[PDB]
Design a protein around this nucleic acid. Structure first.
Ligand code: ZN
Lengths: 108, 57, 13, 42
RNA sequence: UCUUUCUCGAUUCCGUGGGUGGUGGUGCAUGGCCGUUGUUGGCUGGUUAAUUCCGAUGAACG
């Protein structure tokens, strides 16, 4: 399911629609421009890991859970060439540009 | 007498104060350019909007 | 034969 | 009456010519002049 | 600048070098360009005593 999400996050980087960071994720969520959300499963502090799916359910936004945050960050383009490896725990794709249909039927 | 440069206070989890669990814990500015996420600074006597300088007291 | 009053009406070099 | 009617027709023609020419051709000041004078030697 | 949190988001910011340095100062060679060692022609506006004031606005010969 990860390989069918890598292409849609890549085309999100192509069309610059995704919002990196928790702040921009929430700001895309409450504006009702959001299309889907991606959340890292490695979250030590628990008071924000349950807020993201609460906002997604309040705004009827689908959610994908990934195990790693550094790998998610280097997939969404938070690294430069890589020397510095920094990752994000949450990112919301606001709009897209094959496997995106696979993801959207996996939601259903 | 050397003038030290101002350092921004790195606050821990600045995002995690405007939401519960759902609703907006802070006010929303009613201007045209600002809204749907532009939360409203609540100081002990006032409220301020940090983008287009709205002022309520 | 008209439209000379409008010609002198516009004052631009 | 004929001369008056001719004068009225000429006035209508002049108004039409003026309208055609118009078609063919087509408190902040004080405070901003004050800030102009401020920023001139700021 | 000292408090109080609102926003912008990679447009980043901390430290150590006897390592260069660059909005630096300065001389030389260096390419272009001035000045330097005649003759004859040719008015919308306000303003003042006033063709007053400001305001728009070419040629040949040796
Ligand atoms: Zn605002």
């Amino acid at each position: 399911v990860n390989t069918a999400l890598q292409e849609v996050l890549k085309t999100a980087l192509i069309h610059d629609g995704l919002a990196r960071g928790i702040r921009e994720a929430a700001k895309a969520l409450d504006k009702r421009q959001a299309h889907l959300c991606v959340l890292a499963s490695n979250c030590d502090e628990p008071m924000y890991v349950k807020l993201v799916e609460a906002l997604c359910a309040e705004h009827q936004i689908n959610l994908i859970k990934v195990d790693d945050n550094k790998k998610l960050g280097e997939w969404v383009g938070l690294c430069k060439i890589p020397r510095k490896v920094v990752g994000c725990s949450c990112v919301v794709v606001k709009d897209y540009g094959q496997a995106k249909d696979v993801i959207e039927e996996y939601f259903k | 007498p050397k003038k030290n440069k101002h350092k921004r206070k790195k606050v821990k989890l600045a995002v995690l104060k405007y939401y519960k669990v759902i609703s907006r814990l802070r006010r929303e500015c009613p201007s045209d350019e600002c809204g749907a996420g532009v939360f409203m600074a609540s100081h002990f006597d006032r409220h301020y909007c940090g983008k287009c300088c709205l002022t309520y007291c | 034969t008209f439209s000379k009053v409008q010609r002198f009406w516009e004052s631009n070099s | 009456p004929a001369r008056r009617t001719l004068a009225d027709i000429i006035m209508e023609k002049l108004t039409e010519k003026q309208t055609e020419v118009e078609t063919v051709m087509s408190r902040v000041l004080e405070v901003y002049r004050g800030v102009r004078e401020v920023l001139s030697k700021y």
